[PDB]
Amino acid sequence: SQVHIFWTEVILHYRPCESDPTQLPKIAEKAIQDFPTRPLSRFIPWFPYDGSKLPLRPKRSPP
């Protein structure tokens, strides 16, 4: 219901020390909005573990 712009009844925030950005309020509007998300892709390793194949082990150990 409320959004804050640490830069709907909006409670912006200013911190007067930083005030280089000559036009602040229009910058503040952009930060708030939503915009089209990409789907969170359910991930899969491409080369899985086949139990019929056995890997390689060198003999030697660290001192």
Partner: protein
């Protein structure tokens, strides 16, 4: 050497200046190829935060300086009297750079190199200002006069100057003010009240000058009206208008001479009937003359490729510039004919004022051709008849 680059930033774009500078420098160094202007881009940021990039007079050089500007959206503010707020002053106030002024500096075409002289004048002014020269020992009145034939774009060049200077000199003055002075609304004439009225508008000019981080241009139209020739006029019947309103402006302008972030720009029509004590208080009195044959051809081009750009003349034929016709040596050919006929119109349409020149396509597409879409050489013929239509119409009004 040096070359200048100007890039239109969008108002709805709000990225920082140095990011814009880095992005445009990146585009330039990647491309690094004459005076053409970029419009096509390949970066989503740069697209949503730039409108166009342009080179102002094909070389891969890197002697590049960036000027970034924002043409202000709203138009003029109005200036009225302090206690007689009805109509006493009514001066126009542009907060440059301004929207209604862009493309203006490009369109104008002259043949005496007024643009370069009248721009490097202000450049040398700034050079002498930053070097701390003895203002008691080398000085300038900061007043530029332009006079000439009516309708020949004399006043157009002043708005173009102001726009180009608040664009070129950005980051040296945050912005510029341009005060357009109506020299007809300051003649409330009963016993020197106008000569007292000049004082108030000039105090307001002082108000807009002391803001020492803003470059201010004072544009006076009809500077012959404010300063009527007092000496040669053997009319003692002029009680106090010819002596106490010219002397009421020859002081307020000698008062702003001390400051440095002010420039006075004046437009005149009559060379005579103006005070000899004001044709000494102007640094540059440059004469703007009626267009000449090559100039007429270039303006007609500008109009015709403007129409083609908006698809009015649908079948796009290459219009050959006069340099290409000189190179070929005036050889008739199946594409070169149209430029030749344009050039015959140019000699035939000689001596007209620039304003009627920039009108003539309107009439030639108004009466002679009603077609919503026109093929070339009929539209050209429409021009060649509309020019004679203008000659005869001028002869009609005696």
């Amino acid at each position: 050497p040096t070359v200048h680059v100007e890039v239109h930033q969008r108002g709805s774009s709000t990225a920082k200046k140095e990011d814009i500078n880095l992005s445009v420098r990146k585009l330039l160094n990647r491309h690094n190829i004459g005076d053409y202007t970029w419009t096509e881009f390949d970066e989503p940021f740069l697209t949503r935060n730039v409108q166009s990039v342009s080179i102002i007079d094909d070389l891969s050089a890197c002697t590049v300086a960036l000027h970034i500007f924002q043409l202000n959206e709203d138009g003029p503010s109005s200036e009225n009297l302090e206690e007689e707020t009805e109509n006493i002053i009514a001066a126009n106030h542009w907060v440059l750079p301004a929207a209604e002024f862009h493309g203006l500096w490009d369109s104008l075409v002259y043949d005496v190199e007024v643009k370069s002289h009248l721009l490097d004048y202000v450049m040398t002014t700034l050079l002498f200002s930053d070097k701390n020269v003895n203002s008691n020992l080398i000085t300038w009145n900061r007043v530029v006069l332009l006079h000439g034939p009516p309708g020949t774009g004399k006043t157009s060049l002043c708005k173009a100057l102001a726009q180009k200077l608040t664009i070129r000199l950005s980051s040296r003055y945050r912005y510029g003010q341009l005060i357009e002075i109506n020299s007809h609304s300051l003649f409330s004439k009963w016993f020197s009240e106008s000569g007292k009225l000049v004082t108030k508008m000039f105090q307001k000019i002082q108000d807009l000058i002391d803001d020492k981080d803003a470059l201010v241009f004072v544009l006076i139209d009809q500077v012959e009206s404010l300063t009527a020739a007092r000496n040669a006029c053997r009319a003692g019947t002029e009680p106090s208008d010819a002596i106490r309103v010219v002397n009421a402006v020859l002081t307020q302008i000698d008062q702003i001479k001390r400051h440095s972030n002010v420039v006075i720009l004046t437009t005149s029509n009559i060379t005579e009937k103006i005070d000899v004590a004001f044709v000494d208080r102007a640094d540059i009195k440059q004469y703007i003359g009626p267009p000449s044959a090559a100039a007429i051809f270039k303006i007609y081009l500008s109009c015709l490729e403007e129409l083609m750009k908006c698809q009015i003349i649908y079948p796009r034929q290459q219009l050959l510039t006069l340099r290409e016709l000189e190179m070929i040596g005036f050889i008739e050919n199946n594409v070169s004919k149209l430029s030749l006929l344009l050039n015959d119109i140019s000699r035939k349409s000689e001596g007209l004022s620039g304003r009627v020149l920039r009108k003539l396509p309107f009439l030639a597409h108004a009466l002679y051709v009603q077609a919503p879409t026109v093929t070339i050489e009929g539209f050209l013929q429409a021009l060649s008849l509309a020019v004679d239509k203008q000659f005869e119409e001028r002869k009609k009004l005696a």
